[PDB]
Design a protein around this nucleic acid. Structure first.
Lengths: 81, 94, 108, 96, 81, 97, 94, 108
DNA sequence: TGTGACTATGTGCGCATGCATGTGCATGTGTGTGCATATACGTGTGTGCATGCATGTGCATATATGTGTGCACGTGTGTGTGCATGTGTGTGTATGTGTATATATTAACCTGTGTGCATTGTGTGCATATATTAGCATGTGTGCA
DNA sequence: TGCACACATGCTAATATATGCACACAATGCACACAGGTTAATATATACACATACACACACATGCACACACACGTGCACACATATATGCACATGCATGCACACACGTATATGCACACACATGCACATGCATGCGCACATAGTCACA
């Protein structure tokens, strides 16, 4: 859990994601912008997943809750049920 | 035959917030389109919520969760209050 | 029988609770519908309608108009951040767009 | 000593990571980030192991697809270096 | 009905660009825009006609267009749906 | 004779057409285009008058939104005139390809 | 308890197209997700088609129209041919 | 009575016709489900499964692999124009991306 | 850099139009009423499993160094695009008409539901052995000076 | 052309993951029996397509030149590639709480059927806000002093 875990998404990790996206050169300001984008994306998905969990009267977020939340946002994911 | 719409109810709401303001027929059609659209989104999400939890009935709890899923931040909070207040008032008078 | 009271009046709502209940029943959403589900849904629909109509009425008043037209609905929705998100993939007929010119295109 | 020209190792890394399928973010730091974000919605939440895995799979897929769109915006401006304005334009066009 | 795409005239395309905030237009935009509109119309009309067949009708109604637009994520208000 | 400098009346048109809501494509040529396209799907097809109006409303809204995205791509490339590659980029990012 | 999936049916399909090719558990899960996703898309479209036409029954005609709306051009043509052939054989045999 | 045979064998299908009927009936799609609807739906699901599996098996063979993995499913879908359109908004876990480098980034 | 001329958008002012609004028939639908039925819920249960801890290697991360080269800035030039003019033609509006057709009514009948029973296929839990993964020398294969 | 670096390749052990198997059981199929949704035939009103007419505003083509885009060149610092120390993620186990799921009894609540009013939609005027156009003020543009 902890605090300030967005720094755990390191610059080499962001670089690897950019390489998979076919990016050759990366400006130094990309890493801070990428962390903000990821946090916004995760906040939207996790908020909906917890809402599904709360409706089920559960305390554990399941893979199905994440899958339903992703489907709710038009980002359906295969391979987790 | 009779074509049901929400026009007469939208007009009643309009007189509550703007007693001296009218509405055009084309604008009324858009408001009718908006109500049907939001109805289908909430009812569809509530229907899936009952199916995910192996429930066969849609209750106010399913509607409340669907409203939170579909509505943005402040809209969801205020809509939940109106829905809860109406339900509380409804059961107080049977 | 006693005097027939509409469920909308019982819940203090202008939107039809009975019609919403029937639409839920015949809409193929679930085999059963709770008593409070149409009341909750009708209240939410009434609240959202009031939010748009209040904003659109202000837009109509700004343009010195007493009648709401599709343009006023478009101005109300797109100028409200939360309504714009809810209706982000919705086209409003005869609504136009918001006046917006990029600063780079303005003369210097 | 042998030294590769700038962009030669970058091109090799593009071929290397476009060929593999493993997750590119470390699992434990990502799990801590998920729990910290979730604590703002509920207290003392638990996560299934596959729930975090599903989140990481979607997060990395979202970021990789965004970088692909970001790369096109940079090339459109006759550049080869992605910049924050490249990301902002891609997200604006996508509707985010 | 032959070669009606040229009915989308240059002044019509320019007016659409002005509403979009475009200040300057290249001469190659007009042919590119016509191809874009042609592709968009085919997708909506094909679905709208498909709805017409299922109803066993020969008249494309406004609801058929509305349902076709909704299916593509392009919900339109003000035409009965 | 008086002559406005280039781009001066273009900005006037932007303000004019962003204030109004009327359809910008002529109705009759658009109706002919709709019927021509529907021929490849059926023969002897009739259209409701509101069906063609719904198609025109969606078509113009789609094109105007595309031009807004196209304009941002041109400005991103430090230009003020939209080009076909600007449209192609916007559709590619949008996923309309 | 018992969890229901399409894994056994996907495996039989695999053994016809590729008799000597196996599938991983992760790939089988993706195939199960794909079948459920396509099922929900088609059934949802067919359900809306019946409601639009004031019908209470989902028939093969609704399924066929839903296939044409959801699948891309050449995929839809072959899918329609497969569905029509199965219904004809099913009716001819019973 | 007679020896019971499944409707899948009657329709000449491998996907479960009887289970699709139950999923349609209990899925809250309509009040009634016709006899031909599950047969048609099962055949379409079987055909789409066969189309992806035969393309994924080709990708596995191209990689000298005898077992289909998520990478082969992703390669099959993204290299097929129609299947990419059908699954355009779908993320396949552990599928990766297509090898694609813009020519401007290639060495001069 | 202020200043006159030119143009175009905006602001009342006056006036007709058609379109929104209020007023009744009436009918279909929501309501009140018991009634029976089944879903959901509270209670308890046992078990998986997620959390936290402790240990270990070694892989990846962070830091610093040098430098190539891409970004950005400025320059200039051609031409493509905007602006404006004159002309006609195709659009918009109104008018009318015949025709195809979408709609509604009515009878009936076929198909889907419902119910219960027989039972076969399906999923679970285990063996089993295959393909996959991990090394180590070789074998190109590209980059780079 | 030769050197150094990285990815690949035939190669052997090892294992963990997939494959196949046996068993109960829950869901599928089979057989009625019922009933209502759907079809079909008819009639009817609708509104769409077709033609006709007019006037005129818009589209088309032209001529003119402005300034925007594109190429070019310059320099600089930003970012890549590299090396080195090191933090820490990964794997591995071990223990325990604890939450999740099953199972069950059962009351609460929802559907069902029916009578019956009344709320809602269609149709009917009606008047009033919007549109239309004239004149006039007024912000803005673009040479020019």
């Amino acid at each position: 859990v902890l605090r300030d875990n967005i720094q755990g998404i390191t610059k080499p990790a962001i670089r690897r994601l950019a390489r998979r996206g076919g990016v050759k050169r990366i400006s130094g300001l990309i890493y801070e912008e990428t962390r903000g984008v990821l946090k916004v994306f995760l906040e939207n998905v996790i908020r909906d997943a917890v809402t599904y969990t709360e409706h089920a009267k559960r305390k554990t977020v399941t893979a199905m809750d994440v899958v339903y939340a992703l489907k709710r946002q038009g980002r359906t994911l295969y391979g987790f049920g | 035959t009779r074509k049901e719409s929400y026009a007469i109810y939208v007009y009643k709401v309009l007189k509550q917030v703007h007693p001296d303001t009218g509405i055009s027929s084309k604008a009324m059609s858009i408001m009718n389109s908006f109500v049907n659209d939001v109805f289908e989104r909430i009812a569809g999400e509530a229907s899936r919520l009952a199916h995910y939890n192996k429930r066969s009935t849609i209750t106010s709890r399913e509607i409340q969760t669907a409203v939170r899923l579909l509505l943005p931040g402040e809209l969801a909070k205020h809509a939940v209050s109106e829905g809860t207040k109406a339900v509380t008032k409804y059961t107080s008078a049977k | 029988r006693a005097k027939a009271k509409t469920r909308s009046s019982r819940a203090g709502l202008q939107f039809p609770v009975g019609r919403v209940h029937r639409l839920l029943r015949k809409g193929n959403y679930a085999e059963r519908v709770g008593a409070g589900a149409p009341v909750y849904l009708a209240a939410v629909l009434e609240y959202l309608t009031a939010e748009i109509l209040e904003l659109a009425g202000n837009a109509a008043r700004d343009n010195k108009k007493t009648r709401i037209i599709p343009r006023h609905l478009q101005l109300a929705v797109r100028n409200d951040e939360e309504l714009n998100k809810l209706l982000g993939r919705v086209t409003i007929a005869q609504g136009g767009v918001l006046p917006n010119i990029q600063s780079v295109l303005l003369p210097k | 000593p042998h030294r590769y020209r700038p962009g030669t190792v970058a091109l090799r890394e593009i071929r290397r990571y476009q060929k593999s399928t493993e997750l590119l973010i470390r699992k434990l730091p990502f799990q801590r980030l998920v729990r910290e974000i979730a604590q703002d919605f509920k207290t003392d939440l638990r996560f299934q192991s596959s729930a975090v895995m599903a989140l990481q799979e979607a997060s990395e897929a979202y970021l990789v697809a965004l970088f692909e769109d970001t790369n096109l915006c940079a090339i459109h401006a006759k550049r080869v270096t992605i910049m924050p304005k490249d990301i902002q334009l891609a997200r604006r066009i996508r509707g985010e």
